[PDB]
Design a binder for this molecule. Structure first.
Ligand SMILES: Nc1ncnc2c1ncn2[C@@H]1O[C@H](COP(=O)(O)OP(=O)(O)O)[C@@H](O)[C@H]1O
Ligand SMILES: [Mg+2]
Lengths: 214, 370, 141
């Protein structure tokens, strides 16, 4: 709010933290409190625009899902930092002073920021060390098998992470799509026409070893 | 999500409006519309044909006064729309109506069409995010802080005894009569006419109302005071003239306890209270007698509490303690209750949302109010 | 906004002092004419009465819409906002002329979008999809 910004500027120029009493009689003005509460409602709307975000797991590759969840955590922590700022806390304190408890309780709960943060932190172990960078960078069948084994060793850590079973299954489908693309790209470069049959048997033995590992 | 809810206790006599959480209603004004009855001749005269609020009181001699409500029922809905617009104007509440949920109050046993039309006006004309038509008596008891008792609310238009048990108003024990402060002031006008002092104009009915509010009392023994020689207290009218009241001083508020003085075969206010108590459960009668809460403006007559206590003791059973509570904030008790209710987070679950009214209509308020 | 600026200037100490000096000299011609002949009070009343309809009109959403569903939603918003006329004292004939103007803007926006579509060039099923979308917009109107 411009008035809160002006008072914060005035109290910072004096080298002092802001306070509710710095506004004085303006805290009792119904119009000022109504403007602050409308601003807080707008803040709740903007925060809900982010905390309600979700992405279809079937569409897009697994890297897209992991990037989405990591960016969701990155933005949720930024919003959490912005909520603790002196200006927002001063606005909430002023509204609480005028007994406009609706705005404060809604901002505490109606935003859903706490639930979203709890869920995204619960999702943190799975997205923290998701090893698909090795598979996407792998150019040999042995490296692809090693990356697949590492991927499933990391998916072993889904027991202590809350995740929908259907969503995890779609994520495994995405991993399969990436594996198919990587195998297609690797075997395309082998130039099977310009080489003999024993190496072909070796290549298919490696490929079906990868499939059995899957 | 919306701004802080706006409490509007719309009585028949005076509307009391404010924002939820205030200690008292900051925006109280009489519930009538004043229209000028004289000929505007010069440029620079008063602007506007509709005078509501203190502008109507300042120029009271210039205006014909019309009351939209009568006995808690809106008779003129255009005037009611004008008044509720004035509640939101730059003089009162300084805010737009499309942002604040509303907690309107309605007297018990009102017509269904009254509540339906009020909700239609508040959702269509004012485009409120939400609405909640409450009942005055239960709010008054909430304001007192008690959860169980009997609220004998006597306002300008309607008086009613409502027993409440643990916050729930028992609907089969509500007693209501339409004899209230406006009827007492009309009776006072009739008696002043019988004493030679005659008032006709709608603006002079406000002078009669002021005479009622200033010099009128309830005698403990009506028959004893009736037979004795009167004192004839003198009242100074606004123009500077004086009038000697005498016997009309105490026989005017007698109408509350004896409606038969105007030919109505309806119960008295003490009878309303006692019949509301005795219509309830036999288990609750002792605690209802021990918890009686007065409310409304007409309960402010001098000696009202003692007279009502005497009448109730005459009608009540023996060995039953009677405690009539008369809090100082009787005028604003129901508004303070609306403010207390609207402050709670549970009030979010109580209002009829705008979309609910859009999809259902009158049925949404019909289920949500009851 | 201009009338509010004029009103703020009228309440300034200089204007009030000038009017008081003219009153003290019994030059009531100027003071009475300033009070009455300005028309400032009536203009303020009219614009303040009209403000709820003019405040936050969603016409920009219709003007910035580049897809037919967006145009339909903008039309829904515009008519829902035009439903606020009951609160005001706006002239109904002026409201119908405003509806005429909104129709002109809708026609211009539809012409622009269909010009970007190049209807005759594209295949028939895409043409039918665009046509049913446009006629849904007209039915919404
Ligand atoms: N001190 C008083 N003594 C007697 N009557 C009063 C007094 N103050 C207000 N009244 C009456 O009370 C009425 C208003 O009561 P109120 O509680 O405002 O009614 P409502 O519930 O309709 O708002 C007025 O008609 C007025 O005549
Ligand atoms: Mg009342």
């Amino acid at each position: 709010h411009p008035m809160i910004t002006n008072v914060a500027k005035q109290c910072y120029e004096r080298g002092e933290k802001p306070k509710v009493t710095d506004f004085g009689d303006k805290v009792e003005d119904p119009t000022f409190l109504n403007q602050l509460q409308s601003g807080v409602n707008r803040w709740i709307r903007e925060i809900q625009k982010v905390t309600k975000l979700d992405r279809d797991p079937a569409s897009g590759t697994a890297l897209q899902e992991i990037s989405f969840w990591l960016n969701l955590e990155r933005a949720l922590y930024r919003i959490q930092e912005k909520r603790e700022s002196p200006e927002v806390l001063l606005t909430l304190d002023i509204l609480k002073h005028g007994k406009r408890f609706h705005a404060t309780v809604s901002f505490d709960t109606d935003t859903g920021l706490k639930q979203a943060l709890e869920t995204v932190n619960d999702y943190n172990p799975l997205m923290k060390d998701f090893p698909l960078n090795d598979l996407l960078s792998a150019t040999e069948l042995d490296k692809i098998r090693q990356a697949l084994v590492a991927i499933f060793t990391h998916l072993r850590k889904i027991r202590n992470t809350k995740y929908p079973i259907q969503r995890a299954l779609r994520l495994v489908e995405a991993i399969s799509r990436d594996l198919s693309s990587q195998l297609l790209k690797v075997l395309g470069t082998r130039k099977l026409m310009h080489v003999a049959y024993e190496e072909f048997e070796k290549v298919m033995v490696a490929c079906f070893e990868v499939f059995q590992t899957w | 999500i919306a701004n802080q809810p706006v409490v509007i206790d719309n009585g028949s006599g005076v509307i009391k409006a404010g924002f939820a959480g205030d200690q008292i209603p900051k925006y109280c004004f009489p519930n009538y519309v004043g229209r000028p009855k004289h000929v505007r001749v010069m440029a620079g005269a008063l602007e506007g044909d509709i005078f509501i609020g203190p502008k109507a009181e300042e120029h009271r001699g210039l205006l014909s006064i019309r009351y939209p409500m009568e006995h808690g029922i809106v008779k003129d809905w255009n005037d009611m729309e004008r008044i509720w617009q004035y509640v939101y104007s730059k003089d009162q509440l300084q805010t737009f109506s499309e942002e604040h949920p509303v907690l309107l109050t309605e007297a018990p046993l009102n017509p269904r069409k009254n509540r339906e039309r009020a909700a239609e006006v508040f959702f269509e004309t004012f485009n409120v995010p939400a609405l909640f038509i409450s009942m005055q008596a239960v709010l008054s008891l909430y304001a007192t802080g008690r959860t169980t008792g009997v609220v004998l609310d006597s306002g300008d238009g309607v008086t009613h005894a409502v027993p409440i048990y643990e916050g729930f108003a028992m609907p089969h024990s509500i007693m209501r009569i339409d004899i209230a402060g406006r009827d007492v002031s009309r009776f006072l006008r009739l008696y002043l006419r019988k004493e030679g002092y005659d008032f006709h104009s709608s603006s002079e009915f406000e002078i009669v109302k002021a005479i009622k509010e200033r010099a009128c009392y309830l005698s403990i023994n009506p028959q004893k005071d009736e037979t004795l020689e009167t004192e004839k207290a003198q009242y100074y009218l606004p123009d500077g003239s004086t009038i000697e009241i005498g016997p009309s001083r105490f026989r005017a508020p007698e109408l509350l306890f004896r409606p038969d003085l105007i030919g109505e075969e309806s119960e008295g206010i003490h009878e309303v209270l006692v019949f509301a108590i005795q219509k309830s459960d036999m288990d609750l009668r002792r605690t209802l007698f021990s918890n009686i809460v007065l409310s409304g403006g007409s309960t402010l007559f001098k000696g009202f509490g003692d007279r009502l206590l005497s009448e109730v003791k005459k009608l009540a059973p023996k060995d039953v303690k009677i405690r009539i509570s008369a809090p100082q904030e009787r005028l604003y008790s129901t508004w303070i209750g609306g403010s207390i209710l609207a402050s709670l987070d549970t009030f979010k679950k109580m209002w009829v949302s705008k979309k609910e009214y859009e999809e259902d209509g009158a049925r949404s308020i019909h289920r949500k109010t009851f």
